[PDB]
């Protein structure tokens, strides 16, 4: 199948799982330095005034988009009781490295300086899922720099280093859904030349890590991309950022986006939820 | 340093540990097999009618009490809006194996057929710390031979076997807290003979697990019994159950008694609390 075959069959497939009623949902537009930035802002059905998590699907940089991603935002939505804003960010191969994290860093810095318009009183979050988690991360370093001072990033098995070295790449590589061949594939996709891969835009391992915002990190027992996130982790501890990082054994890469048949998928949607609670509300 | 000594210490340390309000507690006495059975009862500051978590305290079968355990299970209360009922269970060396499983199954029983005093219309489940998850555990058990029908457990690092074998109990055996020679000196102060290494109420792994309540089974990375507590998990699953099997990383044994400092513990709490808010009412 073509790439846009496939991009369809996300959205496609996205309707078989049940969408969760929210507050209320608007699509907005978000003013880019580089483009014009749709994203889609969903209510949680409690009061405010709220906390805004900022949400970057995955999907390799390639794939995935608001409509795939929406029964996954609006379940996160009621969990966190919170508003989501999910952004629909420049995808490649049309779009090559650094698109993608520009149009994360441009909503977010968006959303931060218009958090008013959501009556986001309680603060912002980042949040996103494997190439999303990716973005997350990077968006909380590139906050960073500009003082933007963000309430906590929740990096849902996170893509944070090119990697050819860790055992649960060779251990996992083949066999759980997503496979080394993949991963090869989305990279050549995405990145314009071999030194993107000293950038720490594509890999934020890299990156000085202390001031960050705290972290949730979820990762999967049965996934190529484990022992890298768990790394991430260790390195924020290391910075002296507090960060809950979190095994979720028995299951694949891209586990929580199947929620309603892998209930490991649910309990993750609750602990995130939690974490937001908590961080935000005192809950 | 004797038992009576090493169990003050444990009692005045988590003296001065601030205490969550909840909505009321009551001591009861549950009349055991064996003997009268004390059993603090925690409800939350939401109404009826309720879930209810009967919880055992960890502290290898030979410390730890109602008192000492008062903050988390208040913690946990909160988390889960359910009430709980702690279970002071019958303590080694002076009452040896099954004097704790005995107690914790008559309790558990004696709950179960009372919970009404509790307004418990949403069902009944265990947890338990430590050697209160092996506890739990055998429980459980034991409850499916009766045709006693719990509703979820939740194993906080249990003890699930003797075990001489695992990598994580030579890896994590020592500098974390629970060592080899704490382990071997609690069993030798729980244990009658050699013999009872066969009793699957003292290594739950050893029993028939098909028909168990589903699971919460956390386990820790810098743990002795990390192994065994996943095994645990992938055994149920083996046999039909459906379990949340979650790794917190970078912590070691215990941690979720620390709650108050080591953030990840509260956040164990969280989970512990969403997998009890959903099985019981659906949220």
Same mark, same amino acid.
């Given at each position: 199948?073509?790439?846009?075959?496939?991009?369809?069959? $996300?959205?496609?497939?996205?309707? /078989?799982?049940?969408?969760?009623?929210?507050?209320?949902?608007? +699509?907005?537009?978000?003013?880019?330095?580089?483009? @014009?930035?749709?994203? *889609?802002?969903?209510?949680?059905?409690?009061?405010?005034?709220?906390?805004?998590?900022?949400?970057?699907?995955?999907?390799?940089?390639?794939?995935?988009?608001?409509?795939?991603?929406?029964? /996954?935002? *609006?379940?996160?939505? @009621?969990?966190?009781?919170?508003?989501? =804003?999910?952004?629909?960010?420049?995808?490649? %191969?049309?779009?090559? $490295?650094?698109?993608?994290?520009?149009?994360?860093?441009?909503?977010?810095?968006?959303?931060?300086?218009?958090?008013? #318009?959501?009556?986001? #009183?309680?603060?912002? &979050?980042?949040?996103?899922?494997? &190439?999303?988690? @990716?973005?997350?991360?990077?968006?909380?370093?590139?906050?960073?720099?500009?003082?933007?001072?963000?309430?906590? !990033?929740?990096?849902?098995?996170?893509?944070?280093?090119?990697?050819? =070295?860790?055992?649960? /790449?060779?251990? @996992?590589?083949?066999?759980?859904?997503?496979? *080394?061949?993949?991963?090869?594939?989305?990279?050549?996709?995405?990145?314009?030349?071999?030194?993107?891969? /000293?950038?720490?835009?594509?890999? %934020?391992?890299?990156?000085?890590?202390?001031?960050? %915002?705290? &972290?949730?990190?979820?990762?999967?027992?049965?996934?190529?991309? *484990? +022992?890298?996130?768990?790394?991430?982790?260790?390195?924020?501890? !290391?910075?002296?950022?507090?960060?809950?990082?979190?095994?979720?054994?028995?299951? =694949?890469?891209? $586990?929580?986006? $199947?929620? %309603?048949?892998?209930?490991?998928?649910? +309990?993750?949607?609750?602990?995130?939820?939690?974490?937001?609670?908590?961080?935000?509300?005192?809950?």
């Amino acid at each position: 199948a073509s790439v846009e075959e496939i991009r369809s069959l $996300f959205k496609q497939f996205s309707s /078989l799982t049940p969408r969760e009623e929210v507050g209320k949902i608007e +699509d907005i537009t978000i003013p880019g330095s580089e483009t @014009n930035i749709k994203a *889609r802002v969903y209510y949680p059905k409690t009061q405010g005034p709220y906390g805004v998590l900022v949400y970057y699907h995955g999907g390799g940089f390639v794939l995935g988009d608001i409509e795939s991603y929406d029964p /996954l935002c *609006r379940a996160i939505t @009621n969990s966190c009781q919170c508003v989501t =804003i999910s952004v629909d960010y420049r995808l490649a %191969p049309e779009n090559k $490295f650094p698109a993608a994290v520009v149009d994360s860093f441009d909503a977010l810095k968006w959303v931060y300086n218009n958090s008013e #318009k959501f009556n986001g #009183k309680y603060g912002i &979050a980042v949040g996103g899922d494997s &190439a999303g988690g @990716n973005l997350a991360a990077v968006t909380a370093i590139l906050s960073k720099k500009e003082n933007i001072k963000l309430k906590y !990033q929740v990096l849902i098995y996170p893509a944070v280093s090119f990697d050819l =070295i860790t055992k649960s /790449l060779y251990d @996992n590589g083949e066999g759980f859904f997503l496979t *080394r061949e993949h991963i090869d594939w989305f990279g050549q996709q995405y990145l314009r030349s071999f030194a993107d891969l /000293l950038d720490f835009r594509f890999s %934020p391992i890299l990156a000085d890590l202390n001031d960050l %915002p705290p &972290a949730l990190i979820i990762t999967a027992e049965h996934d190529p991309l *484990r +022992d890298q996130g768990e790394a991430y982790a260790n390195k924020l501890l !290391q910075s002296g950022v507090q960060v809950t990082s979190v095994r979720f054994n028995n299951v =694949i890469h891209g $586990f929580v986006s $199947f929620f %309603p048949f892998i209930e490991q998928g649910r +309990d993750a949607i609750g602990l995130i939820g939690y974490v937001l609670r908590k961080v935000f509300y005192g809950k």
